[PDB]
Amino acid sequence: TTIVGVKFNNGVVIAADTRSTQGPIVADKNCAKLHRISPKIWCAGAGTAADTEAVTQLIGSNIELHSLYTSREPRVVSALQMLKQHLFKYQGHIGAYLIVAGVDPTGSHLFSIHAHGSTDVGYYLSLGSGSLAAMAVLESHWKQDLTKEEAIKLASDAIQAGIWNDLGSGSNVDVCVMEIGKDAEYLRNYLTPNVREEKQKSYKFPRGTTAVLKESIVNICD
Template sequence: MPGLNFDNFMRNRYLSAKGFATPTATATGTTIVGCRFDGGVVIAADTRATAGDIVADKNCEKLHRISPNIWCAGAGTAADCEFVTQLISSTLELHALSTERKPRVVTCLTLLKQHLFKYQGHIGAYLIVAGVDPTGPRLFSIHAHGSTDVGYYLSLGSGSMAAMAVLETGWKETLTKDEAMALCGDAIEAGIWNDLGSGSNVDMCVMEVDKPAVLYRNVRTPNQREQKEQSYKFKRGTTAILKEDIKTLVKVVEFDEFEESLLKDADQMQVDA
């Protein structure tokens, strides 16, 4: 087996000397969490999608189905998370058909980490993969460079520090399903209230042994817009017109005149010929 290869380091240094700057990391905003309980696993995410300083979508879906018993939460670039999970979902389905067995969560983890490692972080997908298989409930996290973690509770995204504080405070080995859902909901809300890149609602997916996965869309809506105290629709004529000036920008030609001009042009062309 070959050892470490540093060809890319030499290439990057050569490109930097030629004026090609090394790409920097892109700041993204999301809070995603996962938590295991006795007999299953829960993942949750906020629903705010940002484009720089702009909220591009207030209710996007960050929980992705990979197989009937495996789901993942995605942070990072929305398109990268969407298409990477779709690619691995189809690959895992072919693998399951080939082996005639239900897919394992660790198989999904391996496919994802190998794919992301090939691109050295240029695919901006940070994922929490969770599911149940014949070995029981499993929970993993994958970073864009291909590194992975395993744990009983995990968080990723720009609001992960606030979420992890809640998870570390409230997690215990004897969590029930309802307690795990409440804990994940509280962790996501901590990210929503303490991170500008996270916001809107809370989505959740619960996977239990020998039961189908259940997606809870907008299970919490802490950012609902309140009713305005008064209407700001003004009646027509409220603002006075100080001056009115109408200018003709385009000459309107009737169809008969247009047809007549075409005939004249045709006759003139015949005369010239």
């Protein structure tokens, strides 16, 4: 997994690859590592798939309830605090590593959370096995005051660094843009640089090839 976060002049953008693995086997060639905690608070998750998903939905659900109760837009710090305290309560047993970003009444925010519960703040961040490939790009091309377009390119380039150099990463690049005054824009499969080439032959079998022993209809209607 390669996920990153990058702040630009008027917002924050996050990206991620789309590979899932079980040992050396690709479990899912196109899963979505970008989760919505609230309309304008998005989260990029790495680590144990089910854990990032579950913790992301739980806090998202509580954020919605809190929002409704306070009649206020959710704040990125609230998600950050609820997540970290949860992860800490579990002494790192919940294998979630996340980059949480978003825009709220107080501005744009970029944070990261580790399985044990520590959080960090920055203008650019990366997590996952592709963490280093991505960070090398970020450490090489990030500058203060980037435009929405520059940020997307940088983030997207960082993800590619992981897709190409990290066996734990690959496939596509997902992105989500959160700009201070607009709706967040989720760009699922913003990049698809790994389309499988046309197969050499069709393996469609001639009907009757398979030996059947018995047959029957199944009742679905009650």
